[PDB]
Amino acid sequence: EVEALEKKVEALEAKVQKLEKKVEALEHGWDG
Amino acid sequence: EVEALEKKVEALEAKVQKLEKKVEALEHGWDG
Amino acid sequence: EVEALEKKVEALEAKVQKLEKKVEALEHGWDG
């Protein structure tokens, strides 16, 4: 069950990184 | 402690899904 | 390995909270 949790956590990590990139773009006016 | 971690992870999953929906809306001009 | 997972989860929690704050700002027109 530990390994399954790590995989969920890793999936959230990638989701969160992609969210951070989009939000920083929206907030700074990146890429227009 | 494993079960408590899963509940935290699940809470983040719902937070992250709601974040993804809002950010996709902001970025595509959904709902005006 | 349990403790290392909790630290990752906690890091995501702080990331997610900061994302929620920025997204709520973008969506309500906070701070201009």
Short mmCIF file of C-alpha atoms in Angstrom, two decimals:
data_model
loop_
_atom_site.label_atom_id
_atom_site.label_comp_id
_atom_site.label_asym_id
_atom_site.label_seq_id
_atom_site.Cartn_x
_atom_site.Cartn_y
_atom_site.Cartn_z
CA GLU A 1 0.00 0.00 0.00
CA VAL A 2 3.02 2.23 0.57
CA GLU A 3 4.12 1.93 -3.06
CA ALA A 4 0.61 2.72 -4.35
CA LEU A 5 0.58 5.86 -2.21
CA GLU A 6 3.95 6.98 -3.60
CA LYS A 7 2.59 6.65 -7.15
CA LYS A 8 -0.45 8.78 -6.29
CA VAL A 9 1.83 11.36 -4.64
CA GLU A 10 4.11 11.43 -7.70
CA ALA A 11 1.09 11.94 -9.97
CA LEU A 12 -0.01 14.90 -7.84
CA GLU A 13 3.53 16.30 -7.97
CA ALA A 14 3.44 16.37 -11.81
CA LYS A 15 -0.15 17.84 -11.73
CA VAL A 16 0.99 20.47 -9.27
CA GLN A 17 4.06 21.41 -11.31
CA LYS A 18 1.95 21.86 -14.44
CA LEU A 19 -0.54 23.94 -12.43
CA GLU A 20 2.24 26.15 -11.07
CA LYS A 21 3.53 26.79 -14.61
CA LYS A 22 0.11 27.76 -15.96
CA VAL A 23 -0.72 29.97 -12.98
CA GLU A 24 2.65 31.78 -13.15
CA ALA A 25 1.94 32.36 -16.86
CA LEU A 26 -1.54 33.77 -16.19
CA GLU A 27 -0.17 35.99 -13.43
CA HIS A 28 2.89 37.43 -15.26
CA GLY A 29 1.35 37.75 -18.70
CA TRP A 30 3.68 35.13 -20.18
CA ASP A 31 3.17 34.01 -23.79
CA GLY A 32 0.72 36.89 -24.19
CA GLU B 1 -0.36 6.24 9.80
CA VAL B 2 -0.73 4.80 6.30
CA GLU B 3 -4.49 5.38 6.30
CA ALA B 4 -4.10 8.97 7.52
CA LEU B 5 -1.68 9.62 4.67
CA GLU B 6 -4.13 8.22 2.12
CA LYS B 7 -6.82 10.61 3.39
CA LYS B 8 -4.48 13.60 3.03
CA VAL B 9 -3.53 12.43 -0.48
CA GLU B 10 -7.19 12.05 -1.44
CA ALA B 11 -7.93 15.56 -0.15
CA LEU B 12 -5.10 16.94 -2.31
CA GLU B 13 -6.45 15.01 -5.29
CA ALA B 14 -9.86 16.75 -4.99
CA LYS B 15 -8.09 20.15 -4.43
CA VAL B 16 -5.94 19.53 -7.46
CA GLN B 17 -8.88 18.54 -9.66
CA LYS B 18 -10.76 21.70 -8.72
CA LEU B 19 -7.62 23.75 -9.39
CA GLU B 20 -7.20 22.15 -12.82
CA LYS B 21 -10.80 23.01 -13.72
CA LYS B 22 -10.47 26.65 -12.71
CA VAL B 23 -7.11 27.09 -14.42
CA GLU B 24 -8.36 25.50 -17.67
CA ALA B 25 -11.32 27.91 -17.50
CA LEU B 26 -9.08 30.96 -17.00
CA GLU B 27 -6.81 29.83 -19.82
CA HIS B 28 -9.48 29.01 -22.46
CA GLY B 29 -11.90 31.81 -21.65
CA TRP B 30 -14.58 29.38 -20.48
CA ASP B 31 -17.80 30.77 -18.96
CA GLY B 32 -16.71 34.21 -20.14
CA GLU C 1 9.57 5.38 3.82
CA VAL C 2 6.35 6.45 5.53
CA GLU C 3 7.98 9.59 6.95
CA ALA C 4 9.47 10.54 3.57
CA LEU C 5 6.02 10.25 2.02
CA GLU C 6 4.50 12.51 4.68
CA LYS C 7 7.11 15.17 3.89
CA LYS C 8 6.30 15.02 0.17
CA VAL C 9 2.58 15.23 0.98
CA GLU C 10 3.15 18.23 3.26
CA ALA C 11 5.15 19.97 0.52
CA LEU C 12 2.27 19.43 -1.92
CA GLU C 13 -0.17 20.78 0.67
CA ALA C 14 1.77 24.09 0.89
CA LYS C 15 2.08 24.18 -2.98
CA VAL C 16 -1.63 23.54 -3.28
CA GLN C 17 -2.56 26.23 -0.75
CA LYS C 18 -0.45 28.81 -2.59
CA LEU C 19 -2.03 27.72 -5.88
CA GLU C 20 -5.53 28.08 -4.44
CA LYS C 21 -4.74 31.62 -3.26
CA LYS C 22 -3.39 32.73 -6.64
CA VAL C 23 -6.24 31.13 -8.58
CA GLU C 24 -8.90 32.70 -6.31
CA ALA C 25 -7.16 36.05 -6.89
CA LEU C 26 -7.16 35.63 -10.68
CA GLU C 27 -10.80 34.57 -10.63
CA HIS C 28 -12.21 37.32 -8.35
CA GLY C 29 -10.06 40.19 -9.58
CA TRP C 30 -8.28 40.52 -6.23
CA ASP C 31 -5.39 42.99 -5.91
CA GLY C 32 -6.37 44.37 -9.32
#
